[PDB]
Design a protein around this ligand. Structure first.
Ligand code: K
Ligand code: K
Lengths: 340, 344
């Protein structure tokens, strides 16, 4: 009757979402209050993390100092966590979602649905999930970060969901006064924004490192946004409207990433220090996604014969991989298709 | 024949624009190289410009090209011109248009680079309409994320041109575009132009978030909801076609970002939030009593929206107004965004 929810994942992000989801699942009649959360079992000073969560209601390793609603139950076996769920929330690192799906495949409830909170990527992650698991997939993406959601700092997000009734249910499950949701129906468009924005952010960081000011940076961001839109239209199935890029997943996440984030910070240091991307991944990140995405874009654009339509994306690729001098990045924008 | 250009204005911005336009008028066949530039003469000026070729008071250091002629009388500057480029401080455009009324060449056209908004029967009135109705000429606008010092220094940036007529738009793009000043022409004048006034209201909100200590994700939502209110307000208020897509041009999202991350509205708003000093007091301390336009525009929006019964549909615009003028505690600003129409 009432829908059952499983949170697949339990780090910083998954715990922060459990705080929100546990609360709405209890309050709203349409959800079962018993929310499972799959927690990779760990030994915390002689005690099982799942047992700590189910007694202290605190993920003492990944979200210390925060209480989770007591109706959120930690479950160490991912199949047992998920097998009776009507709604699955995927909130694990990109690195692990493939292995997790390979364990879940075939064990899910009929008519189960999913939403992916995994930002990044070409094959969209939500497609990998939905194909392996056979469930309809939504996405949740916007200008937000786990620690701020845990701290109830005001921010927004976009939910991409094709089915209107399922979108409304996901909004009801996730929305609070400090986590505001807009539902749109263009799943692919919402999700591709999270990957492409990091390419633009590398360019924005180049711009900072070359000594340019905010008006030049605003042009880099905006042209980047124009290339995101054009690329989404040629790559995405489903309708792709420029209007979706006004949502949090688009312009807002692009702004915050281009003004603060590791893609921008590594890019500024590359343009100022001379160090390679790889060296900078070592020094500051113990793989940077922006340059790798640019590489994949180069490959797609060659196939389509459209390299010259995307000079910002391609300058990020050339500078990161083919030795183009970073100092040429702005020159690459001086004959942009948007001004033809 | 070749088109004659008059640059009506000669400030920091008008001189910067002279560099580009003088360069391009001299270079390009379709423009007469003789570009007039109207200069309000100054003891310490139009003679200094035509001799030394430098607006030593308003663009010191820079070389205006030589085919650009200062002219002290604005009618004499403008009367043979086919294209008038209005680039004076907003406070003078009224007086300039009054001197020019009835003295323009047949079929002359105009473009306004004056960012901001005027007053009129519908509350707000676009400067381009003030100009175009006073003079009876067709008007275009040029607006984007750009500032005079950087255009003169040839630092890369973009701008938007709003022009109803395609052939005229293309002419204006040729007059103004360089490798470091890139132009997109769109057909929506009012939409391009209204961004310049509304962005300063959002910037006051962005300044509140900085002075209350919120981070970049909160600020990005303030900026984005502010942009959503710009769009919805232009759709209900503006004449001429209004497209959401126009707000992704330089006049929209780019100028909004730069203004919310640097500019006097953001700076004064942050200081208001951090110190509890009034806008008026901060204007005195920081801007020689010059009036900050973001709050003033917010008051005008309030009146417009109150006459339409729509105050409740623009919570960000209205929170700026109530914080600046009705004593609403600035610390409540974010709360006013927690039941926004965009999320209903
Ligand atoms: K319930
Ligand atoms: K010429």
């Amino acid at each position: 009757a009432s829908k059952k929810v499983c949170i697949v994942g339990s780090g910083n992000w998954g715990s922060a979402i459990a705080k929100i989801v546990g609360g709405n699942a209890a309050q709203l009649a349409q959800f079962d209050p018993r929310v499972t959360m799959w927690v990779f079992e760990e030994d915390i000073g002689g005690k099982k993390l799942t047992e700590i969560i189910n007694t202290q209601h605190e993920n003492v390793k990944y979200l210390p100092g925060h209480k989770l609603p007591p109706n959120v139950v930690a479950v160490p076996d991912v199949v047992q966590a998920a097998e009776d769920a009507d709604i699955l929330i995927f909130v694990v690192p990109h690195q692990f979602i493939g292995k997790i799906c390979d364990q879940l495949k075939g064990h899910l409830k009929a008519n189960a649905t999913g939403i992916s909170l995994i930002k990044g990527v070409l094959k969209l992650i939500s497609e990998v999930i939905g194909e392996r698991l056979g469930i309809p997939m939504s996405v949740l993406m916007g200008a937000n970060i786990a620690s701020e959601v845990a701290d109830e700092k005001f921010c927004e997000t976009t939910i991409g969901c094709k089915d209107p009734a399922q979108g409304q249910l996901l909004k009801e499950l996730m929305q609070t006064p400090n986590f505001r949701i807009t539902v749109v129906q263009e799943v692919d468009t919402v999700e591709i924004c999270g990957a492409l924005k990091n390419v633009v952010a590398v360019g924005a960081g180049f711009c900072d490192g070359l000594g340019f000011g905010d008006n030049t940076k605003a042009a880099v961001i905006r042209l980047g946004l124009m290339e995101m839109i054009a690329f989404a239209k040629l790559f995405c199935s489903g309708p792709v409207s420029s209007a979706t890029f006004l949502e949090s997943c688009g312009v807002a996440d692009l702004i915050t990433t281009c003004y603060g984030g590791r893609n921008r910070k590594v890019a500024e240091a590359f343009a100022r220090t001379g160090k390679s991307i790889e060296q900078l991944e070592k020094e500051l990140l113990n793989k940077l996604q922006g340059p790798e995405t640019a590489r994949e874009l180069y490959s797609i654009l060659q196939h389509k014969g459209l390299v010259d339509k995307f000079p910002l994306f391609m300058a990020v690729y050339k500078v990161c991989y083919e030795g183009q001098p970073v100092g040429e990045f702005i020159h690459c924008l001086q004959n942009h298709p948007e001004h033809m």
